[PDB]
């Protein structure tokens, strides 16, 4: 794998406030050396040497964003974490991790944002 292909698709109702109003959300994509530090870190820690590169994308409700960025050789894993208003911290449904093996060379992996969750759509 040379480039990192990801597609982040949002449903109409994403990052819903208390009033049930859909809001835009920031999704962060991490190029990691290993998945231990990332996984062990909670929301607070993550959003204030495993980090090779970092990318932030803005996701609007009912919108889509395509990530095409150079995969740097050291990147054993890719971390996708959404800066949700009310994320489910017990379940940990606000983030996903993918190993290099999970990546296609020309084709993007589909990450679906719905409500307060990120789901990696099976290939």
């Amino acid at each position: 794998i040379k480039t990192l292909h990801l597609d982040i698709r949002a449903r109409e109702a994403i990052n819903t406030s208390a009033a049930g109003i859909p809001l835009s959300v920031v999704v962060r994509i991490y190029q990691l050396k290993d998945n231990r530090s990332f996984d062990s870190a909670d929301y607070q820690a993550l959003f204030t040497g495993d980090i090779i590169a970092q990318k932030d994308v803005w996701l609007q409700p009912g919108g889509s964003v395509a990530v095409d960025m150079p995969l740097d050789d050291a990147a054993k894993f890719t971390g996708v974490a959404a800066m949700f208003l009310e994320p489910d911290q017990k379940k940990n449904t606000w983030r996903v991790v993918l190993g290099r093996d999970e990546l296609e060379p020309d084709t993007p992996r589909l990450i679906e944002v719905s409500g307060n969750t990120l789901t990696l759509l099976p290939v």
Partner: protein, 239 residues
């Protein structure tokens, strides 16, 4: 009353004449561009060493007593003078301001802001005296602010990012009163589930709301300075 009338004259010569010259036609007393001097306001309303507190201690110790951070008339042995009710109301308002914003002997308070959310808003950027709070609809955290904060360019500003238009300015308010001017423009209501909380809402363009929760360390915090709007220091102590 001859002693009382000479005291009314001492009050205007020692305090009111100077207060009026220094603060008339200036923000926050009037909604104008010209700013009242914060160091000079401190010289007048410092709780213990201020010009007003000194006149009260020196001339009214008998008939007027300090009760905590309040000024209370003596109900027994009035000499037998009648206070001008506007005078008691004025010194009580100023005591409340001093208690919240002039405790150190200079202007200075701390407060916290928690960003809210609204339809069509992607980002809010609130700046006061070089303290910045950027919010992008993530888990809301309380950010602590100081007013006035140390800077060569005091002021406050508020910008936002729309789902349709890009980054827009809500307002840009220069000067040492920047934050107070900004707060005055907000729609404010006392939030009874947060202490000491107020929900703040700035109405941006295209019906967009820029929402925050204000938590003060004491009383109304920076909102207390809005009590100076159209404030008149009475010309008499007694009727």
């Amino acid at each position: 009353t001859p002693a009382a009338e000479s005291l009314n004259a001492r009050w205007r010569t020692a305090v009111v004449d100077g207060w009026n010259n220094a603060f008339s036609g200036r923000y926050p007393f009037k909604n104008v561009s010209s700013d009242a001097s914060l160091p000079l306001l401190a010289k007048y309303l410092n709780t213990d060493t201020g010009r007003i507190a000194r006149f009260l201690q020196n001339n009214l110790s008998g008939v007027l007593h300090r009760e905590g951070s309040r000024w209370v008339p003596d109900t027994i042995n009035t000499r037998g003078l009648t206070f001008n009710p506007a005078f008691l109301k004025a010194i009580n308002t100023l005591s409340e301001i001093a208690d919240v914003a002039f405790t150190t002997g200079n202007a200075g308070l701390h407060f916290e802001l928690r960003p809210g959310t609204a339809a069509g808003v992607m980002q809010t950027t609130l700046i006061t005296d070089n303290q910045k709070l950027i919010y992008v609809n993530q888990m809301p955290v309380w950010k602590r602010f100081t007013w006035p904060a140390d800077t060569e360019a005091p002021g406050a500003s508020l910008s936002w990012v729309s789902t349709q238009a890009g980054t827009r300015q809500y307002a840009d308010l220069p000067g040492s009163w920047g934050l107070i001017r900004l707060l005055e423009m907000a729609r404010r209501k006392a939030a009874p589930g947060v202490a000491s909380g107020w929900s703040l809402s700035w109405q941006a363009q295209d019906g967009r709301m820029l929402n925050y929760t204000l938590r003060t360390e004491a009383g109304e915090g920076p909102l207390v300075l809005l009590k100076l709007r159209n404030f008149v220091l009475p010309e008499t102590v007694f009727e």
